[PDB]
Design an enzyme around this catalytic site. Structure first.
Site, short mmCIF file in Angstrom:
data_model
loop_
_atom_site.label_atom_id
_atom_site.label_comp_id
_atom_site.label_asym_id
_atom_site.label_seq_id
_atom_site.Cartn_x
_atom_site.Cartn_y
_atom_site.Cartn_z
N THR A 187 -26.63 -84.16 -42.53
CA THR A 187 -25.37 -84.84 -42.79
C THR A 187 -24.40 -83.86 -43.45
OG1 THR A 187 -26.24 -85.79 -44.89
CG2 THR A 187 -26.49 -87.06 -42.87
N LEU A 188 -23.15 -83.86 -42.99
CA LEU A 188 -22.15 -82.99 -43.60
C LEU A 188 -21.94 -83.41 -45.05
CD1 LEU A 188 -19.46 -82.74 -40.74
CD2 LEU A 188 -20.91 -80.85 -41.63
N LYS A 189 -21.93 -82.41 -45.93
CA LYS A 189 -21.74 -82.61 -47.36
C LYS A 189 -20.26 -82.44 -47.66
CE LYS A 189 -23.59 -81.20 -51.94
NZ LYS A 189 -22.26 -81.23 -52.64
N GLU A 190 -19.51 -83.54 -47.58
CA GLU A 190 -18.10 -83.50 -47.95
C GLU A 190 -18.00 -83.43 -49.48
OE1 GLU A 190 -16.01 -83.14 -45.59
OE2 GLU A 190 -16.96 -84.01 -43.77
N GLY A 235 -21.71 -77.47 -47.11
CA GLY A 235 -23.15 -77.61 -47.14
C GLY A 235 -23.60 -78.76 -46.28
#
Ligand SMILES: Nc1ncnc2c1ncn2[C@@H]1O[C@H](COP(=O)(O)CP(=O)(O)OP(=O)(O)O)[C@@H](O)[C@H]1O
Ligand SMILES: Nc1nc2c(ncn2[C@@H]2O[C@H](COP(=O)(O)OP(=O)(O)O)[C@@H](O)[C@H]2O)c(=O)[nH]1
Length: 610
Positions: free
Chosen positions: A132-135, A287
């Protein structure tokens, strides 16, 4: 390449049609037991917890919530009654204790813990792996109370404080209000839905107009990025990310991009490839959070939801430096330039020119706004991407495979010799002991022996205290004079906590001995202690911002109050991070265990003070 094959998608909601979300209702007995264990820990004078009560200002019945927060290091005990980070409890109108907000379990970066070593992940997790994209903004928790209140919290707080115009939780609630109006729904509809699901929605508030972090979230991107839904129970059960994206669509959240990868070795290869640029799919990425199932016994047993993170170092570390230097510049302080020296000095000259040309910029930067734009302006001026700017300074470390000298900076009894023996057991590296050299001209002879070990070994442990700066200067100068490609890595045993250091080292030497030459001639415990206090008094900390320690290629901070087994894994993990072609992977925990056990059974000095 793997990064080209795998694309992050926010189109998984269709894949979730028909699927059923996990659901567990709250057990009154189990919830009460949790609240009693927390309450009891909050009153006590290891496991500690802070309890903070908050009124819920939007609650029509006057509901209140208790926010519970552990000491951060407690998450590594096995003692805790829950591993939630973010935990609010409440009481119903009829007096039943309930979990109102349940954050994710505390989770860790690769190589931060035993469980997040790649060697342990490979053995003990199963996929498919959700990347999962770490916004990067602030976390927001959303749940529904029994009276229909939509409760909105930040990681540990809720409500307004008069000491700010808009708290993080209130900013999140204002975003929620706008997103629900945009789709024709209401806060009470979302509250009823989340309470029916016994769930906490977990979003990232990303909005430059509220607060800048690292990447820009302008008006086109600003909002609540839904990245999880957790059950409100003491154990950790979270929604599969396709169902998170379906929930985001139904309730107006921004979606968190997802990649599903079946094989853990492809997961690892993908992440290390993205780490080369800090970008993927043509956007910057700070990340990933990787979600899978984990068992306590490898291969068998029951499996539980478990996360680990993979945070990219560059260009984000350089960007953080630039932000701090900018704050130093407008306040009249000295900018602290640790790394990226040439391009950061150019950045500051650029910022000074901009500030002189437009004085009002300083009043924006005073409020921590406009600083992302200044960086992007400077990169535009340089016609460079940040990742290119962060690679201008390059000592060739990524290509190093040999000619490394490890240099302890320590006092007696910090575990140097034990560490050297363990590293030889694991890697076959050389080990030169100053303690085995007697007579005159010892520092040049020690140094030449260290150098000559590189004939047969890719690295050598230069086993000497180096407690005084003049010894590091001597070693740095004489090695660089005689060997143009050797890299010297300081292993700095940090003596900040000096009275704890004294106790730990003196217990080791008095009880189990030491081959330092002055210890080997000490005939009683008082002579031992006096000798040891001598090295303590003479000790000069490693300071890589001044001469001579500035000459080290890298510095690894170690803890003399910690065991040698812990310092061993710090050394290896940091060497791997600094020189990934030198230490290509961190050995498994079992091998470092065997290395340390071998070290203290094969290396047993005699005690001449008893
Ligand atoms: N897809 C995702 N899955 C999980 N967490 C995510 C996420 N996207 C962003 N996050 C954020 O990532 C955070 C955890 O990573 P870290 O940023 O390293 C915690 P930290 O910054 O060390 O301490 P802090 O959370 O108190 O600031 C979560 O708390 C959440 O806010
Ligand atoms: N119990 C215990 N003993 C240790 C540990 N590390 C080192 N020692 C012992 O402490 C003594 C001094 O260690 P040594 O490696 O020689 O320290 P040095 O003087 O810094 O080289 C030796 O008898 C070691 O076996 C540890 O982690 N635990």
């Amino acid at each position: 390449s793997l990064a080209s094959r795998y694309k992050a998608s926010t189109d998984y909601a269709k894949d979730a049609e028909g699927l059923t979300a996990p659901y567990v209702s709250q057990d009154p007995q189990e919830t009460a037991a949790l609240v009693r264990a927390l309450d009891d820990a909050a009153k006590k004078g290891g496991f500690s917890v802070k309890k903070t009560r908050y009124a819920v200002a939007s609650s029509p019945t006057g509901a209140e919530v208790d926010s519970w927060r552990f000491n951060d290091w407690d998450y590594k005990k096995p003692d805790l009654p829950t591993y939630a980070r973010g935990l609010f409890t409440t009481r119903t109108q009829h007096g039943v204790p309930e979990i109102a907000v349940r954050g994710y379990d505390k989770f860790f970066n690769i190589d931060e813990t035993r469980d997040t070593a790649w060697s342990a992940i490979r053995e003990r997790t199963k996929g498919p792996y959700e990347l999962t994209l770490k916004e990067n903004g602030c976390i927001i928790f959303i749940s529904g109370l029994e009276d229909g209140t939509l409760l909105v919290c930040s990681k540990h707080s809720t409500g307004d404080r008069s000491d700010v115009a808009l708290s993080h939780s209130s900013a999140g609630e204002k975003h929620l209000e706008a997103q629900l109006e945009r789709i024709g729904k209401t806060k009470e509809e979302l509250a009823r839905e989340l309470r029916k699901r016994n769930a906490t929605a977990v979003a990232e508030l990303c909005d430059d107009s509220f607060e800048e972090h690292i990447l820009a979230y302008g008006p086109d991107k600003a909002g609540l990025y839904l990245h999880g839904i957790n059950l409100n129970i003491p154990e950790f059960i979270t929604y599969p990310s396709p169902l998170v994206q379906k929930f985001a669509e139904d309730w107006g959240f921004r979606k968190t991009g997802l990649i599903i990868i079946d094989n853990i070795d492809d997961v690892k290869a993908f992440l290390e490839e993205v780490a080369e640029t800090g970008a993927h799919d043509g956007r910057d990425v700070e990340g990933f959070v990787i979600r899978c199932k984990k068992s306590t016994n490898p291969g068998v047993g029951p499996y539980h939801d478990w996360f680990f993170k993979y945070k990219f170092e560059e260009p984000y570390l350089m960007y953080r430096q630039w932000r701090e230097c900018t704050k130093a510049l407008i306040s009249g302080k000295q900018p602290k330039i640790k790394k990226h020296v040439k391009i950061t000095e150019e950045y500051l000259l650029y910022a000074r020119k901009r500030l002189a040309a437009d004085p009002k910029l300083a009043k924006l930067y005073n409020q921590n706004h406009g600083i992302i734009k200044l960086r992007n302006d400077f990169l535009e001026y340089k016609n460079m991407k940040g990742t290119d700017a962060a690679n201008l300074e390059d000592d060739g470390a990524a290509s190093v495979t040999r000619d490394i000298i490890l240099v302890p900076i320590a006092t007696i009894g910090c575990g140097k010799t034990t560490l050297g023996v363990a590293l030889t057991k694991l890697f076959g590296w050389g080990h030169i002991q100053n303690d085995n050299i007697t007579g005159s001209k010892r520092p040049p002879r020690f140094t030449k022996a260290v150098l000559d070990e590189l004939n047969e070994h890719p690295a050598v442990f230069a086993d000497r205290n180096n407690s005084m700066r003049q010894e590091r200067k001597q070693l740095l100068t004489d090695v660089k004079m005689q060997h143009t490609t050797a890299r010297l890595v300081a292993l700095h045993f940090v003596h900040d906590d000096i009275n704890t250091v004294r106790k730990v080292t003196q217990e080791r030497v008095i009880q189990r001995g030491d081959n330092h030459q002055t210890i080997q001639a000490a005939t009683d415990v008082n002579k031992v202690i006096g000798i040891m206090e001598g090295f303590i008094h003479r000790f000069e900390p490693c300071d890589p911002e001044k001469d001579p320690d500035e000459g080290f290629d890298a510095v690894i901070d170690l803890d003399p109050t910690a065991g040698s087994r812990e310092n061993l894994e710090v050394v290896i993990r940091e060497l791997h991070r600094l020189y990934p072609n030198f230490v290509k992977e961190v050995p498994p925990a079992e091998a470092m265990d065997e290395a340390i056990k071998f070290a203290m059974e094969s290396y047993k000095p005699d005690l001449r003070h008893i």
